[PDB]
């Protein structure tokens, strides 16, 4: 009566040569495979953007839970899980002034080029005219650049 065949679920190798089927559970138990000592971040956006990013980092530095913990496993915490330091103290700010956006945004083909030019030129001049090291750049888009 049209028999069905069953294929097993693959296994992904976490640290210590161990195997699991859910990345969340394996990460919480064993941990990542390689050692990068830290994540030095960089923030581009308004002052409120920096405040929001700092508050979110402070929140994720400590354990968080969900409603149920079988469907969605809890969060032990960044340093407990990944063993890396990603803190708000080491942030390289690059502020976008309110007047800049309020004059530069207000044909929807040139505005979306101009704003990208703004953010990208800030990122590039930070990358080429600074001594600090940033591995990942964060772009905190305000609530008016998307609508």
């Amino acid at each position: 009566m049209k028999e069905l065949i069953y294929i097993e679920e693959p296994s992904i190798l976490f640290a210590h040569g161990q195997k699991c089927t859910d990345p969340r559970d394996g990460l919480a138990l064993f941990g990542p495979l390689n050692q990068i000592y830290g994540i030095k971040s960089g923030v581009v956006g308004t002052q409120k953007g920096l405040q929001i990013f700092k508050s979110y980092l402070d929140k994720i530095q400590k354990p968080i839970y969900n409603h149920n913990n079988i469907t969605r496993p809890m969060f032990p915490g960044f340093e407990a899980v990944f063993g890396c330091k990603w803190e708000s103290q080491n942030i390289v700010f690059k502020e976008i002034t309110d007047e800049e956006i309020r004059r530069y945004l207000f044909s929807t083909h040139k505005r979306t080029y101009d704003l990208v030019t703004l953010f990208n030129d800030k990122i590039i001049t930070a990358n080429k005219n600074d001594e600090e090291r940033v591995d990942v750049w964060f772009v905190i888009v305000p609530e008016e650049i998307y609508k």
Binding site: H16, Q18, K19, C20, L29, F30
Partner: protein, 46 residues
């Protein structure tokens, strides 16, 4: 996994080991099952 059950020193050779050579999670679960069986005391999100 490279040490057979027939090469143990003669002090624990008569006791049954807990399997930890394939998956650490299952061995740890066996440890907790035994600990609950023998009423080992614990003091408690655990």
């Amino acid at each position: 996994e490279n040490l057979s059950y027939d090469d143990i020193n003669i002090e624990i050779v008569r006791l049954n080991a807990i399997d930890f050579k394939k998956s650490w999670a299952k061995g740890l679960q066996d440890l907790l099952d035994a600990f609950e069986k023998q009423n080992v005391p614990k003091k408690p999100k655990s």
